[PDB]
Amino acid sequence: HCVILNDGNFIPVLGFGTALPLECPKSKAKELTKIAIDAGFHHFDSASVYNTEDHVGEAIRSKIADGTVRREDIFYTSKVWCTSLHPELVRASLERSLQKLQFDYVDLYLIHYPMALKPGEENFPVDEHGKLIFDRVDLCATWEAMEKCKDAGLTKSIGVSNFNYRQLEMILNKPGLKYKPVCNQVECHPYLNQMKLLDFCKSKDIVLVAYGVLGTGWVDQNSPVLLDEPVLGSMAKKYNRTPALIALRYQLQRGIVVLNTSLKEERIKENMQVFEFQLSSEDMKVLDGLNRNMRYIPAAIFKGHPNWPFLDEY
Amino acid sequence: HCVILNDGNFIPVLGFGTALPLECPKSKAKELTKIAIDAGFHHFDSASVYNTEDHVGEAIRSKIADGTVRREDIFYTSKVWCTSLHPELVRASLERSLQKLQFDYVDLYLIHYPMALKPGEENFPVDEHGKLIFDRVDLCATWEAMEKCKDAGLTKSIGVSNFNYRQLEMILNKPGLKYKPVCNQVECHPYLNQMKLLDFCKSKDIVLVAYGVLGTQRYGGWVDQNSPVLLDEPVLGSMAKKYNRTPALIALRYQLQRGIVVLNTSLKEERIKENMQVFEFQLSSEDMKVLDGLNRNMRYIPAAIFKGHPNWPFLDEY
Ligand SMILES: NC(=O)C1=CN([C@@H]2O[C@H](COP(=O)(O)OP(=O)(O)OC[C@H]3O[C@@H](n4cnc5c(N)ncnc54)[C@H](OP(=O)(O)O)[C@@H]3O)[C@@H](O)[C@H]2O)C=CC1
Ligand SMILES: NC(=O)C1=CN([C@@H]2O[C@H](COP(=O)(O)OP(=O)(O)OC[C@H]3O[C@@H](n4cnc5c(N)ncnc54)[C@H](OP(=O)(O)O)[C@@H]3O)[C@@H](O)[C@H]2O)C=CC1
């Protein structure tokens, strides 16, 4: 099951992300990758900052050798980090990724955040007081750097992540614009259905790829989470499905491309089930009523940045 | 190595926390307890809300049965959750606990947080909008319930956890006070040395028990997790090389020489052992004030779900 980006390319509605817990060995990514592939996953979401590329790349390659899948049956997304938003550093970043993955190209390249930091190896440069050392950049300048990457054939498509209405407009209403972003990858779940941004994105032919659709110290990790919501728990029993699926399907029927991950092979398989059922129109209106502007990933570490995308209503 | 509490009792300066990562089956705790026991640990920090007591109590009893340790050689701590802060519930919890652990008594009982929630089985009662159902309670009335638990012999010592200046004052300056809290168990580490709260507690014969002394980088998603991490702190990493010790160890040593009781844990037996090494070295006076200069008000455990509560302890400077 796919959908089609405003650049004529197609993308799988269900994607397996590859960001790993701080603990887990980069190597773990590789194993989980394979698992997903054998589970039917063809869409892999990764980023240069995650530092799992080289592994996610190895895994994909491995399944290419034993012919379990063809390179053109795999949609691989990579993202450019904040420390490489300066035009001249955008392409060096994508090639570097490609080098680790040993791919000729990627199927999607995103600007990870509409914010920039001091260029350098350290993905998180900081001062003597421990504060992230920001940096200003002409994003429209960065977007051109991306368009060229698409023209250079390094990526079949390009887009953005964690961009807000204005920031998206800032690019759309760009003088000279050649390619519009095919998507805005943002957190979106029943407690943050991102409708206002979703409809803006729809009225521009841009696809909203969702992450944090299930919500990722003792008290906080044991505080009621998203998949605890009774509006789900019950509705889950209704369809004899698990709440996480109810959560998944909900994002799907909205025409939202949903990402997702797990370290448990038992759950990874379970997520393909999202195609085994539909939600009544009445239930969809019920989930639309759970929203409460609960942004689980605010990117706290950025707050004082000139471009924090989450200050605006959307 | 012990230290004495203002109630005449002694407490091990090094204890093991029995909290478990959301995943790990409640059972894991048992195994982990036994492990640490066989590594020299005698102080075990626990709490009702963790639901690891019956397991932690099974490990201690098992080790008592095979003559590896005697009961009186184990300093066990429990805390009363937010949902049982009403005077008429405090003792019910403590007994509930003793039942699962199968202990005649606990060595220390603390008020887990200065905030209360809707009495009930759910430790995190919420409304139809996902918000926690707060509830007001007269802390002093609770402390009176805490004192009676002492006299009833159910606990040897009593204290508070995650209290700030004012909240401690509000207990100390309590008319008719019988037993001052023996300690204030808070989060404390090189990036949050709690110094101002530390001195106040000392000037009041209240010991300070530090948890999260190494870096949980919790609360927040993957993004925030990457932010500058402690064990990577150069000032520590270097200093560690200077004594041929691990950074975490420099961190545990730093808290000890300040008269602080430290809690710590791990799921790696290799690390649980390595911890005893905190007693094999000393940090020079100079190195001590170097680590003092690391502070940066970095609270990793804010108890975010409580922000809106009337008694959220982390708004005041301390
Ligand atoms: N562009 C951006 O800004 C961001 C992109 N992402 C992308 O999204 C991917 C995943 O998103 P993430 O933020 O982790 O959040 P998710 O919404 O995927 O939820 C995270 C948690 O879901 C749990 N889970 C998975 N399957 C099930 C199930 N069937 N039932 C119950 N719980 C389940 C997992 O637990 P367990 O591991 O124990 O199974 C995991 O910790 C990343 O790897 C990345 O590619 C993420 C954040 C930001
Ligand atoms: N009353 C309250 O409100 C609270 C009480 N607590 C108490 O404090 C206890 C411990 O505190 P906690 O917040 O967990 O924080 P800790 O500082 O104990 O962090 C625990 C982590 O330390 C890691 N670790 C242990 N030794 C080393 C080492 N030598 N080098 C590197 N990493 C190491 C472990 O990782 P790994 O497992 O990978 O080895 C483990 O996950 C709890 O179990 C609980 O009893 C905690 C929070 C709140």
UniProtKB/Swiss-Prot annotation, chain B:
SUPFAM superfamilies: NAD(P)-linked oxidoreductase. Inhibited by high concentrations of substrate. Optimum pH is 10.0. It catalyses: androsterone + NADP(+) = 5alpha-androstan-3,17-dione + NADPH + H(+); androsterone + NAD(+) = 5alpha-androstan-3,17-dione + NADH + H(+). Monomer. PANTHER family: ALDO/KETO REDUCTASE. Belongs to the aldo/keto reductase family. This is Aldo-keto reductase family 1 member C21.
